[PDB]
Amino acid sequence: NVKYGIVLDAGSSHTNLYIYKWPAEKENDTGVVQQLEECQVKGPGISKYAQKTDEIAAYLAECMKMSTERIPASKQHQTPVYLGATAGMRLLRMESKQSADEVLAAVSRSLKSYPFDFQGAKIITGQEEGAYGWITINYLLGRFKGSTFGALDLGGASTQITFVPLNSTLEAPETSLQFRLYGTDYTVYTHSFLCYGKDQALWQKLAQDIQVSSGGILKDPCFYPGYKKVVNVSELYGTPCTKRFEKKLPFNQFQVQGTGDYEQCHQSILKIFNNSHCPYSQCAFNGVFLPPLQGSFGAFSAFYFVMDFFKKMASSQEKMTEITKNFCSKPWEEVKASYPTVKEKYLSEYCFSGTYILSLLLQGYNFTGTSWDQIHFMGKIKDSNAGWTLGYMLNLTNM
């Protein structure tokens, strides 16, 4: 009859549980996997539990109950549950392999305690995360019966780019991934840039820019005029991503003061990217190989959530740069009063995140001019989230 599968996406911002369902896989047809329900776990990402793994159980309980409430009891024992953690957990592992392991063991312990078929709790690789997102979107776009779309994924901690290039090379064979799907072997370029998700990029920029001299203030063009937020230096330096900028600071804490200038914001962003070393034909940034761009792209996760916000304010690069520039210069009190339904944690970041997305796509990946139009921003296709989890489910269902 119907079959179910649960995938937890343990990302750096939040954990999300996904329930998938599909016709039981008979010989007299084939049918599709689709997203049935999603739950967002209340709280931060799992890495924030490193020193309190005894609370992991409780942390996951509400969304796990949704799943036992939602999936019929007679279908539960045979339903797989998997948790994949991403860049937040890769950073925690860099800090301390043991913390990461103690986090993941408490997750297994919790998940194993449910009536579902535990399939594992792992930190997935950057290449897997990228490939699986490319699988999700091409599957949902029906492309697996011709050319495929590239996949751009942006999160809090990392960003991925995955596409089939014109020419397959040994330029950086650790950037290639070959796999078979519906009788076709595929060879994709895929890379995850750790620390270049939107939140880690902001920590890098702040660490880069903070002055010993400042008396505990950082004027910052990436936030609205009148915006103020106090930053703990210990938190700022509590990520591997800012290690290269660490300095002794004569203060424990500092206030960010918005100055709302898109152009200065752009310039300040460009500074956490290195373009000076490329041991290949051409590169993205930080000496990482990138093949020439090819085909159309789906951009999702924070690419979508941030772009769609700016689009709803109006779709060329020139038009999007204008909307962003104007929005950046709007005072923070005006911004909150104009978007009063939006969580201030997201609203406070849109200037920064929009300018960052534009820098990443245009300077990082070279989607300039002609190429800008080859990017399609997407959240759901056929009602399933674009993301890695559906492709993970497809492959874990031996599809």
* 7 to 36: interface string for Cl ion, x by CB under 5 A: -----x------------------------
Whole-number Å distance between alpha carbons of 394 and 258: 45
Stretch that binds Cl ion, among 30-38, 39-47, 123-131, 304-312 (CB under 5 A): 39-47
Whole-number Å distance between alpha carbons of 199 and 324: 18
Q: What residues act catalytically? A: 129
Quote the crossing angle between the two packed helices 97-112 and 87-95, to the nearest 10°: 130
Instruction: For residue 268, state whether it binds its own copies (rule: CB under 8 A).
Output: no
Instruction: For residue 155, state whether it binds Cl ion (rule: CB under 5 A).
Output: yes
> Which pairs with CB-CB distance under 8 Å and at least 24 residues apart come from 369-375?
369/317, 371/293, 372/316, 372/317, 373/316, 374/293, 374/295, 374/296, 374/297, 375/152, 375/296, 375/297, 375/299
Instruction: For residue 180, state whether it binds its own copies (rule: CB under 8 A).
Output: no
Determine contact, residues 26/79, Cβ cutoff 8 Å. no
Q: Please tell me the count of residues contacting Cl ion according to CB under 5 A.
A: 21
Q: What is the dihedral of CA 94, 99, 103, 109, to 10 degrees?
A: 130
Q: Work out which of 66, 172, 231, 362 binds its own copies, going by CB under 8 A.
A: 172
Q: Please tell me the count of residues contacting its own copies according to CB under 8 A.
A: 38
Determine contact, residues 248/211, Cβ cutoff 8 Å. no
Query: If you ran DSSP here, which 8-state letter would residue 300 be given?
Result: E
Identify what 366 binds: its own copies, Cl ion, Na ion, none; CB under 5 to 8 Å per kind. Answer: Na ion
In this structure, how many other beta carbons lie within 10 angstroms of the beta carbon of residue 398?
6
Determine contact, residues 147/163, Cβ cutoff 8 Å. no
Residues 205-234 that bind its own copies (CB under 8 A): 208
Instruction: For residue 90, state whether it binds its own copies (rule: CB under 8 A).
Output: yes
Stretch that binds Cl ion, among 22-30, 41-49, 177-185, 264-272 (CB under 5 A): 41-49
Determine contact, residues 353/286, Cβ cutoff 8 Å. no
Instruction: For residue 192, state whether it binds its own copies (rule: CB under 8 A).
Output: yes
Determine contact, residues 309/239, Cβ cutoff 8 Å. no
Query: If you ran DSSP here, which 8-state letter would residue 361 be given?
Result: I
Shortest distance, CB of residue 167 to its own copies, whole angstroms? Answer: 9
Nearer to its own copies by Cβ, of 142 and 287: the residue is: 287
Whole-number Å distance between alpha carbons of 169 and 305: 34
Nearer to its own copies by Cβ, of 17 and 157: the residue is: 157
Identify what 393 binds: its own copies, Cl ion, Na ion, none; CB under 5 to 8 Å per kind. Answer: none
In 126-261, where does DSSP find H-type helix?
A: 126-140, 198-209, 233-236
Whole-number Å distance between alpha carbons of 395 and 389: 10
Instruction: For residue 288, state whether it binds its own copies (rule: CB under 8 A).
Output: yes
Instruction: For residue 195, state whether it binds its own copies (rule: CB under 8 A).
Output: yes
Nearer to its own copies by Cβ, of 211 and 274: the residue is: 274
Whole-number Å distance between alpha carbons of 297 and 189: 13
* 110 to 129: interface string for its own copies, x by CB under 8 A: ------------xx-xxxx-
Instruction: For residue 181, state whether it binds its own copies (rule: CB under 8 A).
Output: no
Instruction: For residue 234, state whether it binds Cl ion (rule: CB under 5 A).
Output: no
Shortest distance, CB of residue 189 to its own copies, whole angstroms? Answer: 14
Instruction: For residue 102, state whether it binds its own copies (rule: CB under 8 A).
Output: no
* 209 to 228: interface string for Cl ion, x by CB under 5 A: -----------------x--
* 378, amino acid identity: M
> Would you tell me which residues interact with Cl ion (CB under 5 A)?
12, 45-47, 87-88, 155-158, 197, 199, 226, 281, 331-333, 339, 341, 343-344
> Would you tell me which residues interact with its own copies (CB under 8 A)?
90-91, 93-94, 97, 122-123, 125-128, 168-174, 192, 194-195, 208, 240-241, 243-246, 274, 276-277, 279-281, 286-289
